């Protein structure tokens, strides 16, 4: 809760000047993040999906479980089964560690415009911004990789919308 404590001070200095809570038993927050990776078209690319797995096994403290295709949609031959996703959900102390890590080690390999973005919030209070996966993994950088992916990383927030995430990012965010 390193930067969480900074914006905790801002709950009383800024978002008591902004959100104006009636009790300290009521405050804002993010909840967590769901980090479902992408397609990983394992029709026979099961090993590619295993590489996408072992990426986030360690690049992320939690690893995914595959979203198997409940359906048989065209545009890629999915059927009942068809492991074609990822279920990462970073909740607590890992969530804060990833915060204090990634706000700082993303932009070195993001080449961002503002530093994170002007904006790419999808509109439900979250980014879900497709990544080129370079800014991520300073631990396993783009030296030995095998596959690019872009993920709809969903900011699972008590933020009612994206505007709250904006002024929330005093935490090394350039909104």
């Amino acid at each position: 809760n390193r930067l969480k404590e900074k914006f905790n001070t801002e709950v009383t200095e800024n978002l008591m000047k902004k959100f104006n809570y009636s009790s300290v038993m009521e405050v804002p927050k993010i909840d967590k993040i769901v980090v479902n990776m992408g397609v990983g078209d394992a029709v026979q690319n099961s090993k590619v999906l295993d590489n996408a797995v072992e990426e986030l096994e360690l690049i992320t403290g939690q690893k995914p479980l595959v979203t198997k295709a409940k359906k048989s949609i065209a545009t890629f031959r999915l059927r009942e089964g068809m492991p074609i996703g990822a279920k990462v959900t970073l909740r607590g102390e890992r969530m804060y560690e990833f915060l204090d890590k990634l706000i700082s080690v993303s932009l070195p390999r993001v080449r961002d415009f503002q530093g994170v973005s002007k904006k790419a919030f999808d509109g439900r209070g979250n980014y879900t911004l497709g990544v080129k996966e370079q800014l991520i993994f300073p631990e396993i950088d783009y030296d030995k990789v095998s596959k690019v992916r872009g993920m709809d990383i969903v900011i699972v927030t008590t933020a009612n919308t994206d505007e709250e995430a904006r002024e929330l990012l005093a935490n090394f965010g350039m909104p």
Binding site: G125, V156, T161
Partner: protein, 119 residues
């Protein structure tokens, strides 16, 4: 835009989903339970008519310690079982509510079971 709620409502939804078949006839009268946060409360109740039969708890301080959040449940399971020793000292039907045969539940369960009662 993504939030949380009370838990007792879902407790009681499961409770209703079970209540159908497990029904105190006022002879195996319905022994319903409530573990809220701190102390667990209990009552066997004539429910074929919908009227009291007993009343006990862990906030009911006659059987009271600072044991576990659990051994106190065992105490109340002995105690209300003694309030049933007079009558209803037999096997009746408990209610697992939206709760489970483990924990507070099971400690109290076998407390009642072995405080004279035919469960």
């Amino acid at each position: 835009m993504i939030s949380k709620i009370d838990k007792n409502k879902v407790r009681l939804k499961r409770h209703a989903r079970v209540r159908t078949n497990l029904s105190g006839t006022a002879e195996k009268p319905r022994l319903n339970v409530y573990r809220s946060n701190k102390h667990i409360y209990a009552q066997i109740i004539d429910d074929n008519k919908g009227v009291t039969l007993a009343q006990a708890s862990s906030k009911d301080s006659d059987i009271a310690t600072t044991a576990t959040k659990v051994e106190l449940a065992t105490k109340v399971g002995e105690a209300i079982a003694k309030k049933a020793a007079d009558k209803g000292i037999k096997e009746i039907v408990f209610d697992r509510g939206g709760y489970l045969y483990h924990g507070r539940v099971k400690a109290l369960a076998e407390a009642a079971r072995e405080s004279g009662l035919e469960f």
